[PDB]
Paper text:
Tailoring steps catalyzed by SAM methyltransferase-like proteins have yielded particular insight into evolution of anthracyclines and generation of structural diversity. Recent studies have uncovered that [name] is bifunctional and catalyzes additional 10-decarboxylation as a moonlighting activity. Here we have taken advantage of the natural diversity of anthracycline methyltransferases and employed extensive chimeragenesis to probe factors that govern catalysis and substrate recognition.
Next the chimeric pair [name] RTTD and [name] RTTR was constructed to examine the influence of the sugar-binding regions R2 and R3 from [name], an enzyme with higher affinity towards 4 than [name]. The presence of R1 from [name] in both chimeras shifted the reactivity from 4-O-methylation towards 10-hydroxylation, with less than 15% of the native [name] activity measured, compared to almost 60% 10-hydroxylation conversion. Structures of [name] RTTD and [name] RTTR in complex with 1 revealed the molecular basis for the expanded substrate specificity. Regions R2 and R3 are observed in a closer interaction with each other when compared with all structures in complex with 2, closing the active site to stabilize the smaller aglycone substrate. The mutations introduced by chimeragenesis have altered the hydrogen bonding network between the R2 and R3 interface. The α11 helix hosting R3 is extended by a single turn, which positions the helix in the space vacated by the absent carbohydrate unit. As an example, [name] RTTD and RTTR differ only in one amino acid, K190 and N190, respectively, that is located in R4. The same inter-region interaction (3.5 Å) may be observed in [name] RTTD in complex with 1, but the hydrogen bond is not present in [name] RTTR in complex with 1 due to the shorter side chain of N190 (5.6 Å).
Author numbering:
A (entry chain B): 15 to 353
B (entry chain A): 14 to 354
Amino acid sequence: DALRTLIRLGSLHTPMVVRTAATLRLVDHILAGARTVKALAARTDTRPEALLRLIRHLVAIGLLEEDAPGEFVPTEVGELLADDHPAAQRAWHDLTQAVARADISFTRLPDAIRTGRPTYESIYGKPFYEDLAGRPDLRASFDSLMTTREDTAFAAPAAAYDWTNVRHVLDVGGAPGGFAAAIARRAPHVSATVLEMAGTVDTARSYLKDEGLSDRVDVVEGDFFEPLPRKADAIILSFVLLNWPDHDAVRILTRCAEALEPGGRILIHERADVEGDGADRFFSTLLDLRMLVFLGGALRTREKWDGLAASAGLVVEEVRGPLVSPNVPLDSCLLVLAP
Amino acid sequence: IDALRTLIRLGSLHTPMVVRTAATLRLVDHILAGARTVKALAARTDTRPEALLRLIRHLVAIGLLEEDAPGEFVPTEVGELLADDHPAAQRAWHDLTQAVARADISFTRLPDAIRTGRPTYESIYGKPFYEDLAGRPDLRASFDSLMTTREDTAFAAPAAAYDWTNVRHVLDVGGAPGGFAAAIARRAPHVSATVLEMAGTVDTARSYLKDEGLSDRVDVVEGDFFEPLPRKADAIILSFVLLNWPDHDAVRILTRCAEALEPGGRILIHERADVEGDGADRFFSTLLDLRMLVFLGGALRTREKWDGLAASAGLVVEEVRGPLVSPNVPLDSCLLVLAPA
Ligand SMILES: CC[C@@]1(O)C[C@H](O)c2c(cc3c(c2O)C(=O)c2c(O)cccc2C3=O)[C@H]1C(=O)OC
Ligand SMILES: CC[C@@]1(O)C[C@H](O)c2c(cc3c(c2O)C(=O)c2c(O)cccc2C3=O)[C@H]1C(=O)OC
């Protein structure tokens, strides 16, 4: 009972079985004809006796079901492992792609709790970003995973802010540019600038080009720690401050405050857990612990945000309620920061 | 969507690694010894306090810890199983510095085990499983410790599932510490027993039986069970031995046992024998089977697979004795009685 619950919680074979099914494109090969284990083994280049033992666990956890003897089809949850599903969960669990490869850092979590520093380098030889720049195949798969989420996740944050009295918007860490794209559709009178670093600056140009927004959202390069090149009535920090330590985040916040036009606002799009609420913490701590072992960053509660804001001459005006997006598991918040 | 959260939870590595880190840090033991605040726990575990609190946050979410009083954390009923003195020994079984949990890192390369059917332990640690233990005394001793705790209780029910009245001598191939032989001696004082075991791991046998007060009537012989067995016996026992080996090697050990079988004797296999369609619990069975694959290239075998191996060794499965329930042991076992065909 309690012995069963503890063993299930500390089991490594179940999450590795799921990641193996995704890496082998198992669900894809089933939908495309391969019904028997003999055909599934041939298409995945695996030994049939071993694949059946993996399927046996996949059946026991509800990702596959036996429909007629020997024929295995995916369940409704197992259908998410199809490569063309909108949630892209197969790519997120592919051990050859960036995120699931990086999740191996969790096998050294005791070191991360001892030091507070990431363990990615201790497994792959280089830190997270240096390894991406040296493996273009991995940098591409990471850029892809970010773009699949950015194409839909910003309609709700865009709707949670009034843009009538806004002239220009600067998105620091503009990423692919999905947020700036969502602001353009919501408020066509606003001009947007995506400010990115030397690396991601060109993944933003190509994304807004393919959206038909090249003439509507400018993309400039820059460094977040130097003075900002332009002023804006609204500066956006969407999932950027969680990558930097505390002493570097107040600098980015200070530069934003400095470049903030009169009456403007700084918008922080991230999590802001409150100790009292009964909100789901599963996805939040997943992201938080990922930040620890990947880069050393961290999430921040609403109380810590007040400390960061006050240190940048800013004040947290208001946290706009839970932002829900169709295929985005983690609900987010919008923080409004005034001087 | 509920399916999106169900799939992400099943495929998550942060939850099981948080449990193993808590076990490795002896977190629950330090709480029960006075340290309830984070600053006290960080001092006793030699960790960074801000990082420790983030690990505690996941532990309370998954119900292993609870925040009774502000800033003070206490283990739940499930969390109390990570205390080191707990009879199930789950803290040692999740300790990343000890043999079993260290070997579970082999799961990170499970796709290679499905492509080749051979273990992945060597690709993580440089040497195969047993060769790595024989070379790291700290690890072999921790491995011996995990088995010995289980061998102290898991053999009363299997011993009671067999009639020893007409048995004169019992040979236990792969006799482990010697728990099965110790359970038979207490149940049938008229039985002499010999424990057979390979190099290095015979050392754990003589001291366990001595500490059981049975050093008199349980012999211990060092040998290799791919060679002719040291003697004949009315009952030859294979308690969780064959699952460590592939099919061709298991048939050879089975063939050596059939060669040393006295007239009228029986070979007893103590392991699992699931029947496809039984509908019995398969959480503990799949874990052990997949562990055997990545650890050593072994496997569990179904009732039908057992019929094939027995026939290849000149044997027939006469009886399969029902689910054996042993205290603090999550996996019910079985006793297959084999006779010459
Ligand atoms: C380097 C790592 C990185 O920071 C990359 C990038 O910064 C990013 C991450 C996380 C999230 C979002 C990001 O853009 C994001 O936009 C978002 C959102 O709109 C709505 C809900 C959750 C999220 C969310 O959890 C981080 C990550 O772990 O990616 C695998
Ligand atoms: C590496 C160690 C080894 O492969 C071989 C080792 O001998 C052994 C194992 C497993 C079991 C028993 C063992 O003795 C055992 O006695 C037993 C029992 O009496 C009653 C129920 C279950 C079990 C059981 O699952 C394997 C293992 O991986 O440990 C979990």
